[PDB]
Structures are given as C-alpha cells and as structure tokens.
Amino acid sequence: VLSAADKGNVKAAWGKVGGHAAEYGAEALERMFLSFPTTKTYFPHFDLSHGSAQVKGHGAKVAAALTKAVEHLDDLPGALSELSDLHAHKLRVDPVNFKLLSHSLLVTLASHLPSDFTPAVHASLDKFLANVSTVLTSKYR
Amino acid sequence: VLSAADKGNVKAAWGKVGGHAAEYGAEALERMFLSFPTTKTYFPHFDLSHGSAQVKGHGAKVAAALTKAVEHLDDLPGALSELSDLHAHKLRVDPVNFKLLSHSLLVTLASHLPSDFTPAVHASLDKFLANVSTVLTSKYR
Amino acid sequence: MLTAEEKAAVTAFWGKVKVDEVGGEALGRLLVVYPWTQRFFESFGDLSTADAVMNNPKVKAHGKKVLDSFSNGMKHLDDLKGTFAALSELHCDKLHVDPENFKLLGNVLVVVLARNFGKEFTPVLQADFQKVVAGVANALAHRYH
Amino acid sequence: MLTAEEKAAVTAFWGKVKVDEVGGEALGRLLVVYPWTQRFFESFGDLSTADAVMNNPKVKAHGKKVLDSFSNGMKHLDDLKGTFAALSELHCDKLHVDPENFKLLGNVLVVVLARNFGKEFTPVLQADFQKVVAGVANALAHRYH
Ligand code: HEM
Ligand code: HEM
Ligand code: HEM
Ligand code: HEM
C-alpha cells in the first residue's frame, strides 16, 4: 500500500501518459533489452530487432497491466493475481529483472515528461513499481 | 506475504526456540558483526568485543521484537510500527543490512535446531524475516 | 571498456552536459528517492523535505564534485579500476558505504540525463551510458574485496 | 583472500566436510528457498515439492560437483579468479545466471554447514567462510564485470 500522497502522484503521472502508455511500455522494453541483454533470455521466441511488432505488442500489454494496477491502487495483490502466478510460478522470473524493468520505465517516463517528473513524482513512481514488483514475485517472496 | 503453511512453520519453529530466544538474538548479532563488519558502524556506542553485556542485552531486545511479530503474523505492520519509525526515519538503516541480519539469524537457528531446521522451514523462516524486514523498511520503499 | 564506436558516442554526448546542474539534481534525487542515503550527509544541514534537499547549497556543490569524478573517469575509460582506487578506499574503508548504493546513484544519474535531454537520450545512447555507470560503480567497489 | 592462519583454520575444517551429503543439501535448499533458481534445472526432473527436490538424484549428484568445485577453490585461495575462469564463462555467457545467485548459494552453504556442524561452526569460523564465499562469488562473476 502506498501513502495517499503517493497514490495521488502515480495517478497524476499516469494521466499525463494518457494515450501514450503503449508507446512508453514498448520503449521501456527496448531500453531494457539494450541496456540489460540478460533479460533477452526470457524472450527467446521473440523477434527482438529494433522495431519488432512483437516487442510493440507486448509493450502494449505491459502498459495495460500498469494502467489496471493504477486504477486498483488499493488492492494490488488482487488486481494482479493472474499475472503474479504467470511470472512467479510458470516463468520463474528472477526478481532482479523487475528492478531493471522498473528502471527502464522510469527512464522512459523521465524523457517524455520532463516537467512532470519532479523529485516527488519520481519517488512516488519508484515505490509504485516496487510494490508491483513485490506483488508479481509473491508465489515466492 | 505469508501463506498459512508459512505461518504454521514459523510458529512451530519459534515454539522450539522458546526460552533460548534471548540467547539466539545475542549469537545472531555476534555473527553479524564478525561476518559483516560494516554493520558495526551503526553501533559506535557499543563494546562489540565477544561477551559484551551490551550485545546480550540488545540481542534479548531483538529476540523480543521477533516473538511479538510471531504472535501477530497477520498484522506485522501494526505490531512493528514503533520499530519501523526508529530504523527507517531515525537511524536511516541501509536496507542491505536487514538481509545480513536475517542470514545471521538463519545461521544461528540452523546450528541449534538441526532436526527442526528442514528445507521447508528454512524457506518459511526466510520469508518471515524478509516480511519483517520489509516492515521496518516501511518508511521508505 | 566499451567498443570504440560506443566510446565516441558517449564522449560526444558528454560534451553537452552541464555537470554543475545535472550533478546537483542527481545527488538530490538520490537523497529524496532512497532516504537512507541521507545518513551519510547529515552534516549538510536540512534535508527534511524534497525541496529542502533539492535547494540545499552543499548538496548542489557536492553533486558537482561527484560529477567531476565522472568526467574524469570518462577520460580514463580504460583504466577505471585505477582512476577510482583512492576514492574506492575512502568510500569503503573510511565512509562505509554499501556498494549497492554506487549502483543506485549511477541509475539516478541516467534518469537525470534522460530528463534533461529527452529525445536525444536514445535507447542506444542509454545502453552505452549504462555500461559506463556499471564500470564506475564496480571500480568504486573493488576495495570491499 | 585472507591471512595464512585463517586459511589454515578454514582448510582444516573443510577436511571434516562430507561433500556428498552437504553438497546435495545445499543445492536442494537453494532450489527450495529461492524457487526462481529452478528454471535453470528444468531438465533435472521433478522439482515440485521440497521432498522431490531433496530426493532428486540429479540434484544430489550435481550438488556434489559444486562442492568439489568448492574444494578445488580451497586449494587455490589466492588466484580464485583463474580457478573459476572456466565456470565463469559457463555461468555468465552460456547459462546467463544473475551474479546475485552465486551469493545466495554461498549463503545457503553457510547455513548448511551450520546445520551439520552445530557449535563447531563458531561465529569467528563462520566469518572466515563468509570471506571465501564472497571470493568464490566474485570470481564466478568476473566474466560479467
Ligand atoms: C513491471 C512488471 C511487469 C509487468 C507489469 C508485466 C506484465 C506482463 C503482461 C501484461 C504479460 C502478458 C500476460 C498475458 O498475456 O496474460 C507479461 C508476460 C511475460 N512477462 Fe512480464 N511483466 C512485468 C515484468 C517482467 C519481467 C521483469 C520479466 C523478465 C525480463 C518479464 C517476462 C515476461 C515473459 C517472458 C512473459 C511472457 C511472454 C509471452 O510468451 O507472451 N516480465 N508480462
Ligand atoms: C529483523 C530485524 C531487526 C529487528 C527485529 C530489530 C529490533 C530492534 C529492537 C527491538 C530495538 C530496540 C528498540 C528500543 O527499545 O529502543 C532495535 C534497536 C536498534 N537497531 Fe534493530 N532491529 C532489526 C534490524 C536492525 C539492523 C539490520 C540494524 C543495523 C545493522 C539495526 C540497528 C539498530 C540500532 C542502531 C538500534 C538502536 C540501538 C541503541 O541505541 O541501543 N537493527 N532493533
Ligand atoms: C557512484 C558514484 C560516486 C562517485 C563517483 C563519488 C565520488 C565522490 C567524490 C569525488 C568525493 C570527494 C569529493 C571531495 O573531494 O570533496 C565523494 C565524497 C563523499 N561521498 Fe561519494 N561518490 C559516489 C557514490 C557515493 C554514494 C552512493 C555515497 C553514499 C550515500 C557517497 C557518499 C559520500 C560521502 C559521505 C562523501 C564525503 C563527503 C564530504 O567529504 O563532505 N558517495 N564522493
Ligand atoms: C557460486 C557457486 C557455484 C559453483 C561453484 C557452481 C559449480 C558448478 C559446476 C562445477 C558445474 C559443472 C560444470 C561442468 O562440469 O559441465 C556447474 C553447472 C551448472 N550450474 Fe553452477 N555453480 C554455482 C552457482 C550456480 C547458480 C547460483 C546457478 C543458478 C541459479 C547455477 C546453475 C548451473 C547450471 C544450470 C549448471 C549446468 C547444469 C547442467 O549441466 O545441466 N550455478 N556449476
């Protein structure tokens, strides 16, 4: 659970993203693949080339789940239960990777929302992505 | 987050510890200071040499905090509040240190309760200590 | 480290970086986002709120100092373990900073560079900078073993 | 990397370690306590229960090799890097295991040693082992940084 101030900042921030959420989620993925090549290990079935329609598509789905997590900020464990089980039980994603994806997201957000990415918003978003990470790796920690 | 099976293993193991709690709290601290010297910088006012009355006393306090958490496993946030304020707001303890104390505790327990220290118990205890760590870490995420 | 093409891209980009500003913003954000880090800078006076930290004079000054070390490591990109040897022992043996924090500051710097350059901070240019940041963090940490 | 008397204290205690038993317990416990480590052993068969993992022949057999690798490192306590250079290429470039996991396995081994040896695994003796563990973990990780 985030503080009411934090929840306020996340919602304000995601509002400015608006109809760009899928473009930003796909970019966050490209940046994660380039900066941290080990993550590619989880998508051997994907075409990872710059501009891949697979990467674009998946980025839309990633952004969709973040939007749903935002509209359900007071019950993250409940809203992402199916996703929790996919990542923790069937995919066995190492927790380290969630920090890399969270970081790539913050860099993407920071470059598209210069004035909105204030220190307080930054801290609020970091806590949020950390809460989401914590939820997705629950079948285990 | 702790499942019912976990809550069951943690309660079972702590019941075995019993009156040895204070002692194990002291041993865990001694192991931590010896194994990870950097943690000593948080205790400039303690005599950290072997057998110091300040380490015993303090281990007894740490063991008491944990017993309390074991009795209030469903409401860790409510039970460890004061301590969260202290470790996060006041002391500013780097969250890496909590991993180091948890490891020391697990090591201490393993050497005094070998028959009881099974793989499943080790795993539940590990989750309990991480959940406790996350709460004392609450004032920052 | 880095290939020669990477090194050239990184070097040219750095030319536009106002280190006096970026540095202050990076350290301030590190102190706001990861609160425990303030333990090492209590001497800077007031850090109680995001704005007190960001507008704190010693924070902006020390930030400039941290960034200058970076510019200096950028001119010794092949001998990072050597350039930061002294700085490593200071932070490790005299200051007692956990190495994990070197990675956190490194990442905050990348986010700050991203907020200040927007479009120009491309996914490939960021990949290159992540390499440098990792290298610098590892050089600062070698005195822990 | 440690003094010569510590090195002797460690090597002396390593003599009483049954690598067949301890090795399989440690790898097994690694797989149980940190379940994400199982995706690397999906070919070892059934790892659905703590009982399945602990009783798995491939786990017991593989755990022994890891400790032999550990016994090998005991004998090369200075150039830990050169000893594990062949394994570093295996884990880093081939399997793509995150470095954080070498640390977890080393920590799980310390817990396993404490369980098997009781009070003989004193605080001061554990401290030395904690140094060889980070050493092995760091060497295993050098092909990544
Ligand atoms: C911010 C955290 C993350 C969110 C919100 C998220 C969300 C998603 C979503 C929405 C899906 C599609 C699920 C479905 O179709 O039902 C998915 C699948 C998947 N995720 Fe994540 N994810 C996250 C982190 C990670 C991390 C850190 C990795 C590892 C690098 C990863 C690896 C995968 C893989 C391999 C798949 C399956 C791809 C496929 O076969 O279609 N995810 N994720
Ligand atoms: C599961 C983890 C921990 C528990 C349950 C715990 C518990 C406690 C308790 C019960 C107190 C005494 C509070 C009082 O009566 O005033 C305390 C104090 C303190 N703790 Fe922790 N603690 C934990 C982790 C840590 C770690 C990882 C560090 C840093 C290495 C730390 C550093 C301190 C310091 C510096 C004090 C004040 C000591 C004094 O002034 O006497 N604690 N802790
Ligand atoms: C990863 C990048 C880092 C670099 C390149 C760096 C560099 C430096 C430099 C050059 C100084 C000396 C400045 C002077 O001569 O006045 C310094 C001092 C200091 N640094 Fe770092 N640092 C880094 C990370 C950290 C981190 C993460 C912390 C811990 C939160 C930290 C805490 C300090 C402290 C307390 C001092 C002494 C302050 C003083 O003398 O007034 N540094 N650092
Ligand atoms: C830090 C201690 C470690 C040591 C000393 C160690 C030692 C070894 C050794 C001796 C081999 C056999 C190589 C051969 O002869 O072909 C090996 C293989 C392997 N290790 Fe490790 N290892 C360590 C940590 C890890 C970790 C943490 C993971 C992953 C979570 C891991 C995953 C593997 C896998 C998948 C194999 C190949 C098994 C196979 O043949 O299918 N190791 N390791």
UniProtKB/Swiss-Prot annotation, chains A, B:
The modification N6-acetyllysine is found at residue 16. The modification Phosphothreonine is found at residues 108, 134, 137. CDD domains: Hb-alpha-like. The modification N6-succinyllysine is found at residues 7, 11, 16, 40. The modification Phosphoserine is found at residues 3, 35, 49, 102, 124, 138. One of its GO terms (cellular component) is haptoglobin-hemoglobin complex. GO terms for biological process: cellular oxidant detoxification; hydrogen peroxide catabolic process. It holds the Pfam family Globin. It comes from the Eukaryota. O2 binds at residue 58. SUPFAM superfamilies: Globin-like. InterPro entries: Globin (IPR000971), Globin-like_sf (IPR009050), Globin/Proto (IPR012292), Hemoglobin_a-typ (IPR002338), Hemoglobin_oxygen_transport (IPR050056), Hemoglobin_pi (IPR002339). Keywords: Acetylation, Heme, Iron, Metal-binding, Oxygen transport, Phosphoprotein, Transport. Heme b binds at residue 87. The keyword Zinc does not apply. Red blood cells. Gene3D superfamilies: Globins. The modification Phosphotyrosine is found at residue 24. One of its GO terms (molecular function) is oxygen binding. Residues 1-141 form the Globin domain. Heterotetramer of two alpha chains and two beta chains. Involved in oxygen transport from the lung to the various peripheral tissues. Belongs to the globin family. This is Hemoglobin subunit alpha. It comes from Bos taurus.
From Swiss-Prot, chains C, D:
Pfam families: Globin. The modification N6-acetyllysine is found at residues 58, 81. Keywords: Acetylation, Heme, Iron, Metal-binding, Oxygen transport, Phosphoprotein, S-nitrosylation, Transport. One of its GO terms (cellular component) is haptoglobin-hemoglobin complex. GO terms for biological process: cellular oxidant detoxification; hydrogen peroxide catabolic process. The keyword Membrane does not apply. PANTHER family: HEMOGLOBIN FAMILY MEMBER, HEMOGLOBIN SUBUNIT BETA. This is Hemoglobin subunit beta. It comes from Bos taurus. The lineage of its organism: Eukaryota, Metazoa, Chordata, Craniata, Vertebrata. The gene is HBB.
